Design a protein around this nucleic acid. Sequence first.
RNA 1: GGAACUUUACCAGAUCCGGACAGGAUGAGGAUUGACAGAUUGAGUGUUCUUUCUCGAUUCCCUGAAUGGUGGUGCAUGGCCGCUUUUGGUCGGUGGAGUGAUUUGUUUGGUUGAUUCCGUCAACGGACGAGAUCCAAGCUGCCCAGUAGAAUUCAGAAUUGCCCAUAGGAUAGGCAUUCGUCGAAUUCUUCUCUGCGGGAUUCCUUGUAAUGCACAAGGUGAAAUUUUGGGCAACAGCAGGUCUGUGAUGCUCCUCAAUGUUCUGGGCGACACGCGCACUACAAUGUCAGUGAGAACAAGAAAAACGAGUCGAACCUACUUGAUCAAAAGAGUGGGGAAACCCCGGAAUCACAUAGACUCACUUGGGACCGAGGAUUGCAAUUAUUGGUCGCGCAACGAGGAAUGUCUCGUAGGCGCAGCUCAUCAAACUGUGCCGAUUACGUCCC
Lengths: 212, 54, 102, 91
Amino acid sequence: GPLSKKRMIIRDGVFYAELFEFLKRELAEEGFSGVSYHVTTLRTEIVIKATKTREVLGVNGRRIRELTACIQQRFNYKEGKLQLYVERVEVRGLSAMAQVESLRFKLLSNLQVRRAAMGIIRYVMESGAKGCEVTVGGKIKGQRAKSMTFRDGYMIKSGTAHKSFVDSACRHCYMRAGCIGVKVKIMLPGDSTGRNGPSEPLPDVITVIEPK
Amino acid sequence: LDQWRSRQKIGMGKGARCCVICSNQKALIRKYELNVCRQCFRENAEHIGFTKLR
Amino acid sequence: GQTVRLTITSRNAKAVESVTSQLLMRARDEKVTIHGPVRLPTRTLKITTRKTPCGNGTNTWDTFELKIYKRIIDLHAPTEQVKKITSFTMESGVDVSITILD
Amino acid sequence: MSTYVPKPSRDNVYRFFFTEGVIACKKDRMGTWTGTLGGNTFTVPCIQVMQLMRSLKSRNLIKEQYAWRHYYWTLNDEGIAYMRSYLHLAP
RNA sequence: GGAACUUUACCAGAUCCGGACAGGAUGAGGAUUGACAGAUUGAGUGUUCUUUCUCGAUUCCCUGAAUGGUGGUGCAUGGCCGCUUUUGGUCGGUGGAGUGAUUUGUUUGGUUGAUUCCGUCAACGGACGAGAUCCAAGCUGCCCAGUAGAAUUCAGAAUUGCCCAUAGGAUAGGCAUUCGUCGAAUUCUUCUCUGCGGGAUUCCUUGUAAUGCACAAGGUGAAAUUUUGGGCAACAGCAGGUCUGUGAUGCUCCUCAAUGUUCUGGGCGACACGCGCACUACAAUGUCAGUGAGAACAAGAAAAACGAGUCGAACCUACUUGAUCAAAAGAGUGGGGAAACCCCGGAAUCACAUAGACUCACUUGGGACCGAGGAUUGCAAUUAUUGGUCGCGCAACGAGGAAUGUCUCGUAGGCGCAGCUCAUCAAACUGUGCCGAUUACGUCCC
Ligand SMILES: NC[C@@H]1O[C@H](O[C@H]2[C@@H](O)[C@H](O[C@@H]3[C@@H](O)[C@H](N)C[C@H](N)[C@H]3O[C@H]3O[C@H](CO)[C@@H](O)[C@H](O)[C@H]3N)O[C@@H]2CO)[C@H](N)[C@@H](O)[C@@H]1O
Ligand SMILES: [Mg+2]
Ligand SMILES: [Mg+2]
Ligand SMILES: [Mg+2]
Ligand SMILES: [Mg+2]
């Protein structure tokens, strides 16, 4: 023989890294939001997080059926070993990966860049987020490229704690004149159970408790 | 005639190896038999599991 | 006894203890006479690449690390009693391995 | 190898591709492709599976997405109805 | 970016289509695929010409197109990186000020590495950056070990005293001591490993300051002032670099003797020369030949292949052998998926009362240059791949002009070792340990 434990953490990471890229390309307009796979004997689980569960599932599961066997034929799984599921994100406003793919389609449908980006930030900040930041960079106005950022709320950026609290995703928008890249950063509010956001408070918030 | 890829059939060289993500054969990380290109790894270190602690 | 050794390996430090302490809290209920969970040394895995995709700039680097957490537990139960201890739906990313010693 | 695809291979690839619905093939142009009808005996080269599917997609019969180094091809509603005529099957 | 082929982007040639799909004319009375022998050719390359068989609609011939490119443009872009900047900086809201650009907040005063804090204050309330969080190291708790170690007690074995080196100094001392001895037992966590957790806060003390924020000296302590060392780092911006990282991209060029893609052979490495960066030295605080003591980070084998859904072999390695005779090898035989084997990891500086050679010389310093055997890597060693052996050493070089770089404590410097590139090749880089200082603890002179 078996690979070492050091050699198996590598191939289990490159498994998840390749599985993540396949579903990011497929389920972009299904509002894809992540994978968790659970491996055991007799079955390998794959749970897909999405915003459009009627579309990542087919009419009778047709879409996930094809999407199952694409993972089966590639990674050489046998019959019965690989089962896939779809779960939906409960909020849709706290998932930076879903919102950037929608903002990708708001530009590709030839809407105005600033009207599209404030439509994200209004939708993200009404969904309970503490803060949001949309950056659109590219040939926005003309021949020479610009960069615009649009901001509201809090945003922690310098800590290493911003990996816990700030959700980020960057995609490319293929315009007719060039290439535009969009970024969406969402600061996760709450959810002590870990539904969306950490349990512990921010590293500098002290919050002295009141006496009985 | 099928002399067609006779040098690429034997697989000893820097041309036999390849970035498994990014299809390039320049500057690949072969430590831990990882076989990802240098640039195409930093995009994918978080999904493989590597995080820059220090 | 059969002296089965379970190997708990994981990439998450909080998931390897939530398996091992849960797996140990199962194997007290049948009074199995375990030899306690030892913490084998955590192996960190360094890939220190350049930061730049181009060639220029100050030649900056960034070291990436990946720690493997590693636990073993030895227990004297028979081979279908240790499958009673083992069978519970774990967290994702924790590998357990059943091995019989001699 | 050669993109000159023999007729006993083309219908054999199409027998797999109607049954499972999908074909995933590596971009390696010196390596084979292996599929299964119970016997797992195709050993078709990957050069020919690309040529078969590039002819299909140009006739807008399949949907192609490409991951790291693997193709993923899927039949459509017109593509299943087209594939049934080549294999002469009942709906 | 340590390129022999490949890589590869360049040069001389030679193939292949990887020109999908449409539309139009040949088409099963054959569209076409492939190739033995010869000639052609660099080619026992059917590329092609002769020869005739195979393939059996996949193709081919025109027209329209499309897909490929390490082609162009980084001054069309995305992304990432670098750099403005190792700095303490940026932004709204509502109030005040002004016709206005704009101000105020964001400050003159002390303070801190810090718009860090205290005070003042036409501002008041906020947001980011700083601090915090995160990693690593130092002391420590619990847990813990037939993948870490320790003591004991019986057995087994070894030394055992009268001993003063050829010339023989300095230096601890109830039951003497030593351990593949591949012993049995039976009690342990002192060191080891490590998931969460303690501990440091200017805490205490007595001058500076004078309410405050704080500061110096000392205490306490494992640690004393960002504890140390890193990571992460706002806002703006540069017409910085990257179209040679990507199935990142727009435009535009090439597109069947193709700028596609593969072979074959070259080249990237060529040397009147000028520069960056290392390495090796110029010797006696040394070179040599011995001998001793003795590190940490680490790596380590394979596929839907070929073999016997399970197992083998590819990888690193000890040990024997080769050995009635040089290295370098070449072979057996074990072990290891890596705290389990390498391994009691026998690194190199260093050390040595080694009674060892040299003795101030371009010399036993230095090892450039190249001659001749030989053996391994590879499909291939020529424009030596690399090691080893004997030659050469009469090649500069005797401490370096004007100039110039880095550094404040386990540091500089020295020393090696791993990993990474890697079939073969480190004067590289990323890490790690070992030996271990001089000076300052200042200033605005440059
Ligand atoms: N993120 C830390 C930054 O430190 C900066 O301040 C830094 C500088 O004042 C100063 O840094 C200097 C640096 O300027 C100069 N170019 C070199 C010097 N070695 C550094 O010194 C610093 O770093 C080294 C650690 O290796 C230590 O020797 C020393 O204790 C420390 N003062 O010390 C501080 C680092 O501790 C700025 N305050 C700010 O940009 C930022 O906070
Ligand atoms: Mg389903
Ligand atoms: Mg390897
Ligand atoms: Mg105003
Ligand atoms: Mg001179």
